Amino acid sequence: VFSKEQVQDMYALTPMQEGMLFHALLDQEHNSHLVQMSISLQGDLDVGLFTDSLHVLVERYDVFRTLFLYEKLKQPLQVVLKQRPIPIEFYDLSACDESEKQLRYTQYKRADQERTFHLAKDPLMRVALFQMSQHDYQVIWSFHHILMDGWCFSIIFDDLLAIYLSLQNKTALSLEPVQPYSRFINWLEKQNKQAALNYWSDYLEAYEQKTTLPKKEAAFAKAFQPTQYRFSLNRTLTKQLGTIASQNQVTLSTVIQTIWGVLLQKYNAAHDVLFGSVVSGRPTDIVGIDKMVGLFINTIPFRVQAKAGQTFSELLQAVHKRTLQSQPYEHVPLYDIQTQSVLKQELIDHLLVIENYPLVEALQKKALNQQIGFTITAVEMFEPTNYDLTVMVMPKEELAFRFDYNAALFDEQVVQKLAGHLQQIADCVANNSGVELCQIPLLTEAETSQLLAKRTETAADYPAATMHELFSRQAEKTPEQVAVVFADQHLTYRELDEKSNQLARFLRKKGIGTGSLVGTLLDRSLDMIVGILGVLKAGGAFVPIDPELPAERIAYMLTHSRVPLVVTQNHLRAKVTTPTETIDINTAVIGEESRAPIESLNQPHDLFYIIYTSGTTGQPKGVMLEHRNMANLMHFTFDQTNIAFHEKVLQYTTCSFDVCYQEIFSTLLSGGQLYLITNELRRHVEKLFAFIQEKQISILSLPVSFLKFIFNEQDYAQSFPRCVKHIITAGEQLVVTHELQKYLRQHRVFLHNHYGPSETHVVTTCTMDPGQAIPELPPIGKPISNTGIYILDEGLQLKPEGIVGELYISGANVGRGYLHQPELTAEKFLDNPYQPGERMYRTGDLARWLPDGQLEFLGRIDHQVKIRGHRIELGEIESRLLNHPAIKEAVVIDRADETGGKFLCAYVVLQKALSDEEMRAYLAQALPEYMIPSFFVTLERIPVTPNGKTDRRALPKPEGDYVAPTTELEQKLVAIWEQILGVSPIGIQDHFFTLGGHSLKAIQLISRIQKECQADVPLRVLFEQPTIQALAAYVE
Amino acid sequence: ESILVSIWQNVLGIEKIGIRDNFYSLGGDSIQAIQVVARLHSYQLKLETKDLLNYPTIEQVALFVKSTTRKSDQGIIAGNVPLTPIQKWFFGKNFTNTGHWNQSSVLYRPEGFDPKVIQSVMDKIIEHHDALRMVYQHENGNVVQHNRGLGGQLYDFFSYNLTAQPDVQQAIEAETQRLHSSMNLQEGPLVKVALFQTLHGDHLFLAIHHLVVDGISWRILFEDLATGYAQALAGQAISLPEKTDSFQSWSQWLQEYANEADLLSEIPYWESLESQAKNVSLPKDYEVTDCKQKSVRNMRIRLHPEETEQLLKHANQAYQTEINDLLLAALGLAFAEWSKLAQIVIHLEGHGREDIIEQANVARTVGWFTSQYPVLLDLKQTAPLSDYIKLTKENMRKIPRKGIGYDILKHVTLPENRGSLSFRVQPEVTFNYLGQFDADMRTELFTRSPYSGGNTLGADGKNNLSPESEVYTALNITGLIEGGELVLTFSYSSEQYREESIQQLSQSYQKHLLAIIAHCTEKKEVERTPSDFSVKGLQMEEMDDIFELLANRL
């Protein structure tokens, strides 16, 4: 029975034991709150004496006679009993058959790992002895994870053996007093806890981007299936990292942690990374602490950050400084350190622990020192693995790494490549200390040559001719066919060719040499196609001077281009502002000029085409292209996809932009028929539907936004002719709705989702899904013929598949430069290191190679949203908006507050009148908290930039009830919740995380509820929802 | 010094180490740093491993090596001393005739007490204990202490033969009373030594002014005098123990502590006392405003040896009390029966030398350390005696530190720093339990004189306070053990109470203390209380909740 005499003393839990008791009560989804130590002891141990020596050990330590009382108290307590004998089970198996011994042993050990300790009842240690053979004893210890860390066992077993040597030889004891853990409590009380938390709140300041490593699947379960991948660095490398440490005057542990930082910088891409170091939170300030048994071991956020040009030595010192400065405050529990971060619970997700002294060969090290009857001959330990990855490191003659990894979430190929990259970092850093943090390569040569396979596959032997000859070599094949039609009037291929010859001859007589530029201020009309091709047979760069644009920007295009001549119709000439002659294409002299061809002096590299665009910089950019670029793209388009002689193809896009002056030649060079929309009708979707009905258009071009918009006219899309077969699209990061999937499926449409930035060439990568189910955010695609897509870091170094970086585009699909501000050519263009002598163009787009070999799209790096941990893919928010049936048209944008802090926002057009909180609640079901728009504005229509992309800079920035102090749902339940929280009155169903609450309050809450509400309610209930009504089902 | 360099040579396995070398270049690590510090301790040097890691080079780290224990000063200290709380209380109270406010004792040695030996021991004992030379100088209209060197006249010496006088006792009484009045606090000896020779041997009268001694300092002085006397009488040079931290430095540290946050955090408790003590008021038989010390009568009650021995050895165990908790719970019931007050404020003297200053060592330091703190006792809940002893026991542990902070806040701390305090609880009842009355009778080399008479060191010292000084406490209560009997002494003015009313109080004390001894010794089990468990802030209702709850868990 119990009588009050048995309790020695009682204590408040230390913060570490609060951490473990929180865990052991909340995280009961698994049973392994337990450590198991398995030891083998060859020689002849004496069973009785060893059994006695364990009881003397339990009487000696107050820790081992602690029980933890928590169920109904004001506060959890330790309670220490003067006697609490732990179970010792002895088994003799000497007579058993060898397979039966090893079976019965392994069964017992596995059952022991699965049996839980009740913190208020069971003695929190177990021992079993197995006598194998006659001289081959084994012992299994297990203790609760709340008593002490694994390392304390090296103290405990030294006490045990001293007791056993005593009890055998009959000698009295030599053991020193037990160093009291209360001494560390008084020191935790001595430290200024506010100044400590303030330090970490200063260390974690710039922590926007949360670190990750690539996980095979989302964390759908906490149930581990551990595996261990272990590897070592060679002798020559392991002595070299020690030398590097000595020369830079840092510990070797700081070399290893800096190499691991550089890895986590090249994974991801960020110059700012954080991971858990594990620290023995034993302050040197306290006496006897290396012989003190208890939970001292703690995890702290190690945080490596670099500047762009920083050399490894400079980072290595900056890390050294940071770790020496952190050393005072490392006793602060991680759950307090987490409280100061913007990320809270999510802050750390893997560990890197460096072990100069493992438990093996510190426990086993005793051997020669004592005459005890036996030699300890293995020790193995099982522990609660808390994180999906732990990197162990053991500095030895070979630096032995061991990744304790959850094989549920890491592909073994991920872990294997991780080990190869970790060695290749170490190799570079060791061969020369001064190398930068860029230009350290990750890749092994196998993956280097694999990535350099992408440039060499998809090579092509295409004929790469000058451009207008290829139209000629088509018009000769079927001249009588109708080439172009506008309004209700058309040209044949012969007429188009002859009219082009007329214009070209006349332009050449007007002095157009092929290297010159000629403007094309022309309506989207038969004369305009003749314009383009005639200027092209004059050889010139046909400048796409869009007559719809305001006169000031047109004047800029004219003047900045220094153009000698322009081809126009008459009525547009009000927009001309320059010392320039102007060819009225209707002039009678052009009708009198010869229709026959003229001798081509052109060459494939000559200056073919120019474009001006919208942009982030103020001055028009002035792109330029060469004939060889069209040659390569056109052959790819024509031979590897389809446009055909019978196809009625719209030039469905405005002349100002990249796709328009490729969809044209894509029709002529394949022999199709071009239809031109009367451009006012291009603004009238209902009339576009009518036009397509009247003209039976069979191949389509849609801007990404235009494709977001068209299929919301659900009745017109139902009324749509079934003649459609292919859609071409461009512009970044298309959103596909399930509705528009249905409308593609209805007509088995070949959606060619091309991509490509206008300066390299108009497209360079391709996706299609004619029958297969389409992703809601379609990938970029494959690289096309004779192009090298690459992903490179700021050192121009490759980086491994499945990891993000800047997209670089190379091959035949690359312009000459920019026309003016020409050193922007040096900022944007380079010679490719990986195809020496091929031109290459730096996009600022973030992109990734996928497992299937497609490229994947992450948006422009200057636009990179990184809100509160998350590299949020904005298209998902738009997807959940546009898939909501009550929404027609909606847009999500990055906006900044009055401090400059970023916040998500949405602009919405509805199907019907409703309370907007309904669609906010729909997103609150469909989206995590970090990616629902912070606020919403509702509108009649969303305008666009004339390229069709929404004018986010023009759209106006937004601007701009549940309390329950006297309106209880159930009086007792809410009043108790208020009395527990204490800091404020509480709302009708107020949220504990919006209130910023913490785990210690949560345990005090549940333990109050257990007596004050009498609800036998799982603590998991409070971590599912803080909504107070949940208790009503439990109290009834 | 180069000890540290040789310890790097050992722990970093390296010869010919350069004088400038860097710990991390030498191949060091935190595992070597802890071993370096664990090595220096064998030379009695302490170094922080944190400092070794931050300053990785020989000389930078050597500038922060410290000795593993502080050496207290060996010199003849001198100069100014700040008035400590009880000294400033003494000069504040402004007694008539303040110079004659002494403590004294008379020693005896049957085989004689040779004059020149004791003079040489006095020369040493006064040179070594750097407080017995104080001078109080009344400069600028305050009082300022000055502690002075070997300026001569360290003590005042006299020798007399009484063997020729038919009444030895009256002769020594008359001359010791004559010595007491000669104290000058200004520029004169505070120590008066007189040697009386008698037919059965020699006696030593010591008188020392109360501003520089207390009970513990008398235990120090007697054992250092006995050691010096033995040394000189055998013949060797006098070697007294090592001087702990001198009273000057204690005063300076107490000035510097008196304004720290640690002390000021006691203000909510002493506020919670004073605000609750305000109206508590002892009845009197006669209203008289002040009385001179000659009006102090006293009377005594004695426990028999068997009941005393039950008290000292057995009766504590039933509640893990200290002796004081039982003597106070009896005083509580005695006031409850005699006055029928509901609440009473009793002033307790503490021994004063608490670990208030972390570096400070004071066990060998001579001076007036006594602290005064009030204790409010409940008399309301007196009915179930088992629960009244637990209440009284708990009060003594609830009191911050051991009350040393109260007098510092009253007399030393800066007057804007101390907030709500309104120090208006004057002494009315004062209590002090002396232990064995054996500060004197604890070495065979001499013994307490039979002739001590009115010159004793305790409460029954008639002579050491001026007859014309004022009675600063209405009732003064002291216990001591003599001959194994506990003797409780009640000192009171015969102008404020009549003898039959204090005889009531002292008999009503005796019955209630014998009740508490019987109760706590007949009770077979032990009942601990919340102050026994390391839970900071445990309460009775909660402690019995947890002891029900463990009985339901197990």
Ligand SMILES: *P(=O)(O)OCC(C)(C)[C@@H](O)C(=O)NCCC(=O)NCCNC(=O)Cc1ccc(C2=C3CC[C@@H](OC(=O)NCCNC(=O)CCNC(=O)[C@H](O)C(C)(C)COP(*)(=O)O)CCC[C@H]3C(C)=NN2)cc1
């Ligand atoms: P609310 O927010 O919900 O509340 C939060 C909680 C409580 C609910 C919960 O989420 C929470 O945060 N806490 C509990 C769960 C949790 O997430 N853990 C955080 C709490 N702290 C931890 O316990 C973290 C932790 C758990 C488990 C491991 C594992 C280890 C152990 C690591 C490693 O330890 C060692 O023994 N070796 C360390 C290195 N050697 C040392 O001894 C220290 C180094 N320095 C020293 O001082 C040395 O001692 C020397 C030799 C004296 C000198 O060295 P010099 O200074 O360099 C061993 C490896 C085993 C690990 C594995 C694989 N499993 N777990 C780690 C951390």
